[PDB]
Amino acid sequence: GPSRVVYLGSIPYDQTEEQILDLCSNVGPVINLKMMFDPQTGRSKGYAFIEFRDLESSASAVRNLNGYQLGSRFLKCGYSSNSDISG
Ligand SMILES: [Mg+2]
């Protein structure tokens, strides 16, 4: 199926949350940005999950941000979904 959610990886560790919000906001309207962290140090893991308002924007994120050079790195972007099951 289609997805309004994308994975954004290979992000330089020094990139901040404000910075990644801005980049994704340039592509399209962002509903939520989930940046991943190492909880012990508070440091960025260099990847995030972004929910966009609609399917066109997420697709635009994948088309434009996959291979996009940010800092000294090339970003990886693709569609994301997940299940949730309890134990
Ligand atoms: Mg990564």
User: How many whole angstroms from 30 Cα to the centroid of ligand 1?
Assistant: 21
Distance between CA atoms of residues 6 and 64, nearest Å? 12
Query: CA torsion angle for 2, 56, 32, 79 (degrees, to 10)?
Result: 40
Domain that holds residue 62: 1-87
Contacts of 34 (CB under 8 A, 6+ apart): 48, 49, 50, 51
Any idea what the CATH number is for the domain that residue 38 is in? 3.30.70.330
Q: How far is CA 32 from CA 4, 27, 29, 67, 86, in A?
A: 11, 14, 9, 22, 24
User: How many whole angstroms from 8 Cα to the centroid of ligand 1?
Assistant: 8
User: How many whole angstroms from 12 Cα to the centroid of ligand 1?
Assistant: 8
Total count of domains within the chain: 1
End-to-end CA distance of the chain: 26
Resolution (A): 2.0
Task: Dump the DSSP string for 48-65.
Answer: EEEEESSHHHHHHHHHHH
User: How many whole angstroms from 34 Cα to the centroid of ligand 1?
Assistant: 14
